[PDB]
Amino acid sequence: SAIERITKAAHLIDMNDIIREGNPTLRTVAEEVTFPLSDQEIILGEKMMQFLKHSQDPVMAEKMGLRGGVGLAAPQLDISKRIIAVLVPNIAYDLEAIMYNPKIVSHSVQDAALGEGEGCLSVDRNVPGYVVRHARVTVDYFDKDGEKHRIKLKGYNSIVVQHEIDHINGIMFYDRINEKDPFAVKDGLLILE
């Protein structure tokens, strides 16, 4: 299985582990993990975080052939589990978390979108447009110990977490771009830039 291969001590996640558009797994709703977690489920979260760290390092990213990322979801590794990793550097890190069964439990009426549009590791093409998301979200999740966390996110952090949660719900960023006018600025839409 993907999880067995990826959680081998020797394995370093790279782009060859990341599935792309066309793979049904990206359009599938991931299964909740149960507690207590298996060792493999814990190692997987740690491997995902290590990938994010590698992808953000100029030397390692060049050596390993990595696209940069600030978030990753298990389904992108062909593992249909509700596990995401987020690692957002400060303008050391603004947000660093491995989240098990993450869930948005509240959100703002106001929307937001990155002014530069979004890129996805599973998408090997540019898809222009404002990806419309909630401006602010309250997120529940469990850490590796089964402890519950409840956090409130805004700005870039809010966008990234919603992006990764979308992955575990079979949703892709371009699903949220305005079909007619990709760059419409609707009332209540905050453009981040």
Ligand SMILES: CNC(=O)c1cccc(C)c1Nc1nc(N2CCN(c3ccccc3Cl)CC2)nc(N2CSC[C@H]2C(=O)NCC(=O)NO)n1
């Ligand atoms: C289409 N627009 C862009 O690609 C883009 C261009 C300029 C600026 C931004 C913010 C853009 N959009 C973007 N950019 C990023 N990058 C910016 C560069 N980062 C980076 C690059 C090299 C070294 C170090 C770093 Cl930090 C990684 C994150 N991630 C995401 N997406 C949209 S929300 C989640 C985020 C992401 O991580 N996507 C990867 C993914 O598919 N996760 O599932 N979206």
Ligand code: NI
């Ligand atoms: Ni993505």
